[PDB]
Amino acid sequence: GLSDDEWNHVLGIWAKVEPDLSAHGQEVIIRLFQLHPETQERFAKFKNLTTIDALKSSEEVKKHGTTVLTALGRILKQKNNHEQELKPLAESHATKHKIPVKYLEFICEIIVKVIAEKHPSDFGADSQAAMKKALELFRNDMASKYKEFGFQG
Ligand code: HEM
């Protein structure tokens, strides 16, 4: 996938994200639901969190956003060989939650967005290109794994 000098850009940011992972994680979930309300339907647990304000104030939502980013970071860190980290993610998203590859792309777009919003002097063109290509490789590999579980995407 990526060249070392892209991974360098990816890891470069990521280090700047971890100090506030929790905050980032929650903004990504809230933004997902608010820009794409269909995704909210896949979370039985957040079903009731109807207004925005009930989202901003859920500590389940923050906890789950933190969980989403944590796994991402683990996978970004393995750089190009991240199969042992993806597999369990692919399995649950395919056989359990049943998440389309399109929703995957939706969240990847927001992750990039949230980072840019939060790190204006550091998240530049180059880093943005590289981040995208990293999330794109993740999306692909997820989609591929999905097939081994009989799920389409
Ligand atoms: C690429 C970003 C994503 C990552 C890194 C991520 C990862 C997480 C992790 C670590 C879990 C819990 C462990 C597991 O069940 O495997 C979680 C739960 C789950 N994920 Fe994701 N996820 C991704 C995107 C998506 C998207 C776009 C959706 C669609 C709305 C989604 C919906 C869910 C659901 C429904 C659960 C169940 C939560 C619960 O049991 O209440 N995920 N995911």
From Swiss-Prot:
Which source organism?
A: Caretta caretta (Loggerhead sea turtle)
**Keywords tagged on the record:** Cytoplasm, Heme, Iron, Metal-binding, Muscle protein, Oxidoreductase, Oxygen transport, Transport
Listed binding positions for nitrite are 64
Q: Per its record, what are the GO molecular function terms? A: heme binding; metal ion binding; nitrite reductase activity; oxygen binding; oxygen carrier activity; peroxidase activity
Give binding positions for O2.
64
Which example biological process does GO assign this protein? Answer: removal of superoxide radicals
Q: Which residues bind heme b?
A: 93
One CC-aspect GO term: extracellular exosome
What's the name of the protein?
Myoglobin
Localization: Cytoplasm, Sarcoplasm
Which ranges carry the Globin domain?
A: 1-147
What EC number(s) would the UniProt record show?
1.7.-.-, 1.11.1.-
Entry keyword Metal-binding: yes
The answer to whether keyword Transport applies is yes
Q: What is its main location?
A: cytoplasm
